Design a protein around this ligand. Structure first.
Ligand SMILES: Ic1c(I)c(I)c2[nH]cnc2c1I
Length: 327
C-alpha cells in the first residue's frame, strides 16, 4: 500500500526537512514564562495555563515527562514544520530546567471548552463548521508530509466565542515515506482504524480519516465514543458488528492478511447494520441524508477507499460553510 495523494512530499524536499534526528534545539529562556494553573495531563505530559512575563500575554505550558532524545526531536521538528498552517497549534518557544533538564514546550493560548460539556450544545450548523475547520488542518498537515495519528476530541481545542479551533498534541505524528512500515500502537483505542487492529503496517494519511469518521459518528449520533471496545481485539469486534463481516473478508484477502486464530474466532460472523439504525429522539435533528452519505464515505475498512481531507471539504454536507466563507 502507498498513499493515493501527497505520496512524494518528503521525497522532493531537502533531507533536513524530514531528517528530524539532525535537529539541534535552540533553547529559550525558562524565566520568560510562569505557570498560573494546571489545565490538563496525559501519559507523557502536564499542561498549564501560564503567562509570558515580558509582554503579559497568556500562553500554554506543556512540561514533558522523561522522553527519548529521538522521540522529542520528532515532535518539535513536526511542530516547527507546521507553525503557521490553518488551525495548527503554534509552538512559541522550547525551554528546560537547568538542574533537571526537564523540557517544556510553550504554545499560543486557546481558550477551550471541554468537549464533553460543549458538543451536546452544538447546533447542526456548528457541527458542520467545526468539522470543516478540523478538515483544514488535516489537509494542511497531509499536504506537508505528516500523519497526526491521534485525532480525537481531546486533541482538538475550541474557543466557542471566537469560533476558532486548533489541532493539538503532535506527540504521535510521523513523516509519511512511500513503502515504509509502521508501528500500529498509535491513536487511542476508540479511534484506531482497522489497519491497525489487523496489523497492516504500511498505512498512510487515511488513518486520520477513520478517526475523524469516529469523531463525527459520535457527534451526530450523540454517542461518545461511537465504537466502544474494552481492548484491541474487542475494538475490531465492535466495528465488525456495525460494518458486517463480509466487508472484512474482502479487505483481508485484498491485502492478504491472515487474521489471528483467536481474534477470528472472537469476530465471528455478522451482517451490515444500516447507519439509520442508530437514529433516535435525541439525535434526528442532526442526522440528515447528507450527514450519513458523508459518514459512510469516511468509515470503510479499506483505507484506500476513504475520502481524502481535500475531497471531504468539498462534499455538499459542507455547502453552507463554504458559502459563508466565499462571502
Ligand atoms: I485545556 C488544553 C489546552 I487550552 C491546550 I492549547 C492544550 N494543549 C495540549 N493540551 C492542552 C489542553 I488539556
Amino acid at each position: 500500500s502507498k498513499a493515493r495523494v501527497y505520496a512524494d512530499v518528503n521525497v522532493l524536499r531537502p533531507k533536513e526537512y524530514w531528517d528530524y534526528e539532525a535537529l539541534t534545539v535552540q533553547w529559550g529562556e525558562q524565566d520568560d514564562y510562569e505557570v498560573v494553573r494546571k489545565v490538563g495531563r496525559g501519559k507523557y505530559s502536564e499542561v498549564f495555563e501560564g503567562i509570558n512575563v515580558n509582554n503579559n500575554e497568556k500562553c500554554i505550558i506543556k512540561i514533558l515527562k522523561p522522553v527519548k532524545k529521538k522521540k522529542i526531536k520528532r515532535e518539535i521538528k513536526i511542530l516547527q514544520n507546521l507553525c503557521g498552517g490553518p488551525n495548527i497549534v503554534k509552538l512559541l518557544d522550547i525551554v528546560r530546567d537547568q538542574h533537571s533538564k526537564t523540557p517544556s514546550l510553550i504554545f499560543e493560548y486557546v481558550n477551550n471548552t471541554d468537549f464533553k460539556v460543549l458538543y451536546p450544545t452544538l447546533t447542526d450548523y456548528d457541527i458542520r463548521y467545526y468539522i470543516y475547520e478540523l478538515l483544514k488542518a488535516l489537509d494542511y498537515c497531509h499536504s506537508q508530509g505528516i500523519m497526526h495519528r491521534d485525532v480525537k476530541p481531546h486533541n482538538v481545542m475550541i474557543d466557542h466565542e471566537l469560533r476558532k479551533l486548533r489541532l493539538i498534541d503532535w506527540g504521535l505524528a510521523e513523516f509519511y515515506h512511500p513503502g515504509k512500515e509502521y508501528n500500529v500502537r498509535v491513536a487511542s483505542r476508540y479511534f484506531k482504524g482497522p489497519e491497525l487492529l489487523v496489523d497492516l503496517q504500511d498505512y498512510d494519511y487515511s488513518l486520520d480519516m477513520w478517526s475523524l469518521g469516529c469523531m463525527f459518528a459520535g457527534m451526530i449520533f450523540r454517542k461518545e465514543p461511537f465504537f466502544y471496545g474494552h481492548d484491541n481485539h474487542d475494538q475490531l469486534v465492535k466495528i465488525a458488528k456495525v460494518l458486517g463481516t463480509d466487508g472484512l473478508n474482502v479487505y483481508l484477502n485484498k491485502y492478504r492478511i491472515e487474521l489471528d486464530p483467536q481474534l477470528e474466532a472472537l469476530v465471528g460472523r455478522h451482517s451490515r447494520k444500516p447507519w439509520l439504525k442508530f437514529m433516535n429522539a435525541d439525535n434526528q435533528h442532526l442526522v440528515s441524508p447528507e450527514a450519513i452519505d458523508f459518514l459512510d464515505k469516511l468509515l470503510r475498512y479499506d483505507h484506500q477507499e476513504r475520502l481524502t481531507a481535500l475531497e471531504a471539504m468539498t462534499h455538499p454536507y459542507f455547502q453552507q460553510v463554504r458559502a459563508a466563507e466565499n462571502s
